[PDB]
């Protein structure tokens, strides 16, 4: 579904795609980094 | 029917928390009624619209 | 090479005149106030 | 108390001097004069400096951070009373509060 | 009235939404408007325009 | 009734110019009250002697504001730091003239020091302003630190 | 060495008995025995500080000075930093105005203070708030230098925990505290805990 939508969007617009699957697997969440006092985005949202 | 928001003296802070809003009547979303006889103000869970 | 330069720059005479004018304006504005105290009489003698 | 403060200061200064002497026996004394006609720099970089931090005094440690603070201070939390004097309530510790009231 | 309104101007409560209200004797001369009255006073009075 | 406005200028010609300017400024609004006298001190080498000199030769006369300027002969090795510190000890405002180093631009250290020239960042501001006019979008930033 | 110790008119007003820190043998185990010279100073000022330190330098050559005074002026720290930078004398204060920390120091400086940063104080403040269950409050900070760092740190710490804080509002109260502008936005503090940040007089 998303591939077809992306194809239609790219045809209507003007750009080229180099689709690469996520590395981690999780959808994406905020979490506190281990052995620290901060937090960050993990999962697929991280690559954003 | 609505207070025209007169200027305070000559130079006060211009209002930035008042803003007009439009609306159109529809069946289940916005219902316009009359004014309650007792307690001649509007009902508790209602807002006054001109 | 696309550079830049302030038009006045090292023209200390104009800057001196304008600074004196601004300070004169400020002292004229300020001296008509409810409370005014003179500056310290010297570096040595007080710590206020 | 103030005597403890001055003793600790003398201790840290002497420890830094001993460390710089152990590194080498240069130990520059001082400069020519604070003021006058002198304008050229005197210290190589600052004579002694990097040995003035991350130092201990046989027990409680105290290392000055790069910005000038400490890293393990001795903060306490105090409050007025009906007699108008900061008395005490609790203190700070390694990383724990341990309030009294 | 003029003294109190002037004193309250040098305070928060003379803004856009601080509607004041005064009886007739506070505005009893019509054409003798002092400086310190706000521009939003509401006052009731026996009519002299008509009648 | 009488006030003073000291300055720390470069050479004697600038002192004469300052005196003439203050005398002229006394002509516009001189309806009694203010008299607005003036004093004079020239730049000095070193830093400690400079602080001693500013203390005595200015604050012995009850100044209302000091006026500092860049040294004529040397490079930035004689920046007007000691005057700023000594004046900011008592919170007496001091005005800079041609000192652009972006270190005085923050108020954390030099609490009372307001100048009359844009230090350096307005160059970046005009860069950005002209960037749209010349229509360039993708840029890189190479700078010292 | 010739370390110089310089306090004045404090709770430790012994003066004569103040000559006991390293005066006796104490722990004389470390090599390079030092000589301690004391002094008593009542008033502080830029010219007086300059003259006293320079006179000490011209005489018994000091390898480091230990300061400490009684007054509350915040700029004595800046004056000491200026002294150390252009003299290469390792000065460090302990108690008084020569200790309160307000701003960083130049890299060439050698002036250290027995103090704590704003961040540590903010952490202790939040910890003492959390223990007594007062997690609702509002900030009131004036235009004193360093307020932006305090506001940012408190905001980040609130937005980085799990307790459930509720910052009611942040007030940047400014201008003379007599006018209407001060009073209009000082009336909106409806919470029960306030976290003022200002100098002593303000």
Swiss-Prot record, chain A:
Subunit details: Heterotetramer; the NMDAR subunits are modular and harbor tiered domains that function in concert to regulate opening and closing of the cation-selective ion channel pore. Forms heterotetrameric channels composed of two GluN1/zeta subunits (GRIN1), and two identical GluN2/epsilon subunits (GRIN2A, GRIN2B, GRIN2C or GRIN2D) or GluN3 subunits (GRIN3A or GRIN3B) (in vitro). Can also form heterotetrameric channels that contain at least two GluN1 subunits and at least two different GluN2 subunits (or a combination of one GluN2 and one GluN3 subunits) (in vitro).
Similarity section: Belongs to the glutamate-gated ion channel (TC 1.A.10.1) family. NR1/GRIN1 subfamily.
Residues modified by glycosylation: 14, 34
Origin species: Homo sapiens
Residues included from the entire protein: 458 to 505 of 938
Record protein name field: Glutamate receptor ionotropic, NMDA 1
Comment, domains: A hydrophobic region that gives rise to the prediction of a transmembrane span does not cross the membrane, but is part of a discontinuously helical region that dips into the membrane and is probably part of the pore and of the selectivity filter. The extracellular N-terminal domain (NTD) is a site of allosteric regulation to modulate overall receptor function.
Subcellular location: Cell membrane; Postsynaptic cell membrane; Postsynaptic density membrane; Synaptic cell membrane
Curated annotation (Swiss-Prot), chain C:
Disease as annotated in the protein's UniProt record: Neurodevelopmental disorder with or without hyperkinetic movements and seizures, autosomal dominant: An autosomal dominant neurodevelopmental disorder characterized by severe intellectual disability and developmental delay, absent speech, muscular hypotonia, dyskinesia, and hyperkinetic movements. Cortical blindness, cerebral atrophy, and seizures are present in some patients.
Subunit-structure text: Heterotetramer; the NMDAR subunits are modular and harbor tiered domains that function in concert to regulate opening and closing of the cation-selective ion channel pore. Forms heterotetrameric channels composed of two GluN1/zeta subunits (GRIN1), and two identical GluN2/epsilon subunits (GRIN2A, GRIN2B, GRIN2C or GRIN2D) or GluN3 subunits (GRIN3A or GRIN3B) (in vitro). Can also form heterotetrameric channels that contain at least two GluN1 subunits and at least two different GluN2 subunits (or a combination of one GluN2 and one GluN3 subunits) (in vitro).
Residues of the full protein shown: 266 to 313 of 938
Location in the cell: Cell membrane; Postsynaptic cell membrane; Postsynaptic density membrane; Synaptic cell membrane
Record note on what altering residue 41 to Q does: Found in a patient with schizophrenia; uncertain significance
Record's protein name: Glutamate receptor ionotropic, NMDA 1
Family designation: Belongs to the glutamate-gated ion channel (TC 1.A.10.1) family. NR1/GRIN1 subfamily.
Domain of life: Eukaryota
UniProtKB/Swiss-Prot annotation, chain E:
Binding positions (Zn(2+)): 31, 47
Compartments in which it is found: Cell projection, Dendritic spine; Cell membrane; Synapse; Postsynaptic cell membrane
Record note on what altering residue 17 to N does: Found in a cutaneous malignant melanoma sample; somatic mutation
Entry superkingdom: Eukaryota
Entry's free-text remark on domains: Contains an N-terminal domain, a ligand-binding domain and a transmembrane domain. Agonist binding to the extracellular ligand-binding domains triggers channel gating. A hydrophobic region that gives rise to the prediction of a transmembrane span does not cross the membrane, but is part of a discontinuously helical region that dips into the membrane and is probably part of the pore and of the selectivity filter.
Subunit structure: Heterotetramer. Forms heterotetrameric channels composed of two GluN1/zeta subunits (GRIN1), and two identical GluN2/epsilon subunits (GRIN2A, GRIN2B, GRIN2C or GRIN2D) or GluN3 subunits (GRIN3A or GRIN3B) (in vitro). Can also form heterotetrameric channels that contain at least two GluN1 subunits and at least two different GluN2 subunits (or a combination of one GluN2 and one GluN3 subunits) (in vitro). In vivo, the subunit composition may depend on the expression levels of the different subunits. Found in a complex with GRIN1, GRIN3A and PPP2CB. Found in a complex with GRIN1 and GRIN3B.
Protein name per UniProt: Glutamate receptor ionotropic, NMDA 2A
Residues shown, of full length: 236 to 286 of 1464
Swiss-Prot record, chain F:
Positions annotated with a glycan in the UniProt record: 37
Modifications the protein undergoes after translation, according to the UniProt entry: NMDA is probably regulated by C-terminal phosphorylation of an isoform of GRIN1 by PKC. Its phosphorylated state is influenced by the formation of the NMDAR-PPP2CB complex and the NMDAR channel activity.
Source superkingdom: Eukaryota
Cell compartments where the protein resides: Cell membrane; Postsynaptic cell membrane; Postsynaptic density membrane; Synaptic cell membrane
Function of the molecule: Component of N-methyl-D-aspartate (NMDA) receptors (NMDARs) that function as heterotetrameric, ligand-gated cation channels with high calcium permeability and voltage-dependent block by Mg(2+). NMDARs participate in synaptic plasticity for learning and memory formation by contributing to the long-term potentiation (LTP). Channel activation requires binding of the neurotransmitter L-glutamate to the GluN2 subunit, glycine or D-serine binding to the GluN1 subunit, plus membrane depolarization to eliminate channel inhibition by Mg(2+).
Similarity comment: Belongs to the glutamate-gated ion channel (TC 1.A.10.1) family. NR1/GRIN1 subfamily.
Protein name: Glutamate receptor ionotropic, NMDA 1
The organism of origin for this protein: Homo sapiens
This protein's encoding gene: GRIN1
Residue span relative to the full protein: 25 to 169 of 938
């Amino acid at each position: 579904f998303c591939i077809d939508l992306l194809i239609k969007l790219a045809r209507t617009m003007n750009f080229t795609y180099e689709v690469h699957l996520v590395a981690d697997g999780k959808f994406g969440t905020q979490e506190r980094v281990n052995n620290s006092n901060k937090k960050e985005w993990n999962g697929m949202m991280g690559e954003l | 029917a609505v207070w025209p928001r007169y200027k305070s003296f000559s130079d006060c802070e211009p209002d930035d928390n008042h803003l007009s809003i439009v609306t159109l009547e529809e069946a289940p979303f916005v219902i316009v009624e009359d004014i309650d006889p007792l307690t001649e103000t509007c009902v508790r869970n209602t807002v006054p619209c001109r | 090479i696309l550079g830049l330069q302030l038009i006045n720059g090292k023209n200390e005479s104009a800057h001196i005149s304008d600074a004196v004018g601004v300070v004169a304006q400020a002292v004229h504005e300020l001296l008509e106030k409810e409370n005014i105290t003179d500056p310290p009489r010297g570096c040595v003698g007080n710590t206020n | 108390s103030l005597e403890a403060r001055v003793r600790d200061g003398i201790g840290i200064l002497t420890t830094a001097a001993s460390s710089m002497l152990e590194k080498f026996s240069y130990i520059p004394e001082a400069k020519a004069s604070c003021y006058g006609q002198m304008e050229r720099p005197e210290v190589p970089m600052h004579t002694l400096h990097p040995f003035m931090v991350n130092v201990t005094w046989d027990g409680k440690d105290l290392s000055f951070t790069e910005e000038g603070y400490q890293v393990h201070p001795r903060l306490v939390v105090i409050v007025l009373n009906k007699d108008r004097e900061w008395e005490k309530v609790g203190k700070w510790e390694n990383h724990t509060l341990s309030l009294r009231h | 009235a003029v003294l109190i309104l002037s004193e309250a101007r040098s305070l928060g409560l003379t803004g856009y939404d601080f509607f004041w209200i005064v009886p007739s004797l506070v505005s009893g001369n019509t054409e003798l408007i002092p400086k310190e009255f706000p521009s939003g006073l509401i006052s009731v009075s026996y009519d002299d325009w008509d009648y | 009734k009488i006030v003073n406005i000291g300055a720390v200028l470069s050479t004697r010609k600038h002192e004469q110019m300052f005196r003439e300017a203050v005398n002229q400024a006394n002509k516009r609004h001189g309806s009694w009250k203010i008299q607005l006298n003036a004093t004079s001190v020239t730049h000095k080498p070193n830093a400690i002697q400079m602080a001693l000199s500013v203390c005595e030769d200015l604050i012995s006369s009850q100044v209302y504001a000091i006026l500092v300027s860049h040294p004529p002969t040397p490079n930035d090795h004689f920046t007007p730091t000691p005057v700023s510190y000594t004046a900011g000890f008592y919170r007496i405002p001091v005005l800079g003239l041609t000192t652009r180093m972006s270190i005085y631009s923050d108020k954390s250290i030099h609490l009372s020091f307001l100048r009359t020239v844009p230090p350096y960042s307005h160059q970046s501001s005009v860069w950005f302003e002209m960037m749209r006019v010349y229509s360039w979008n993708h840029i890189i930033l190479l700078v010292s630190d | 060495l010739n370390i110089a110790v310089m306090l004045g008119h404090s709770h430790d007003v012994t003066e004569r008995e103040l000559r006991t820190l390293w005066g006796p043998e104490q722990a004389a185990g470390l090599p390079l025995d030092v000589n301690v010279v004391a002094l008593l100073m009542n008033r502080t000022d830029p010219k007086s500080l300059i003259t006293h330190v320079c006179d000490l330098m011209s005489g018994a050559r000091i390898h480091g000075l230990v300061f400490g005074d009684d007054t509350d002026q915040e700029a004595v720290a800046q004056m000491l930093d200026f002294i150390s930078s252009h003299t290469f004398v390792p000065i460090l204060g302990i108690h008084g105005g020569a200790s309160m920390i307000m701003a960083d120091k130049d890299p060439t400086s050698t002036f250290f203070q027995f103090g704590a940063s704003i961040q540590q104080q903010a952490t202790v403040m939040l910890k003492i708030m959390q223990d007594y269950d007062w997690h609702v409050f509002s900030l009131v900070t004036t235009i004193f230098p360093g307020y932006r760092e305090f506001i940012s740190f408190v905001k980040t710490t609130v937005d980085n925990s799990f307790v459930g804080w509720d910052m009611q509002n942040v007030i940047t109260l400014d201008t003379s505290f007599e006018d209407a502008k001060t009073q209009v936005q000082l009336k909106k503090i409806h919470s029960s805990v306030i976290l003022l940040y200002c100098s002593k007089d303000e």
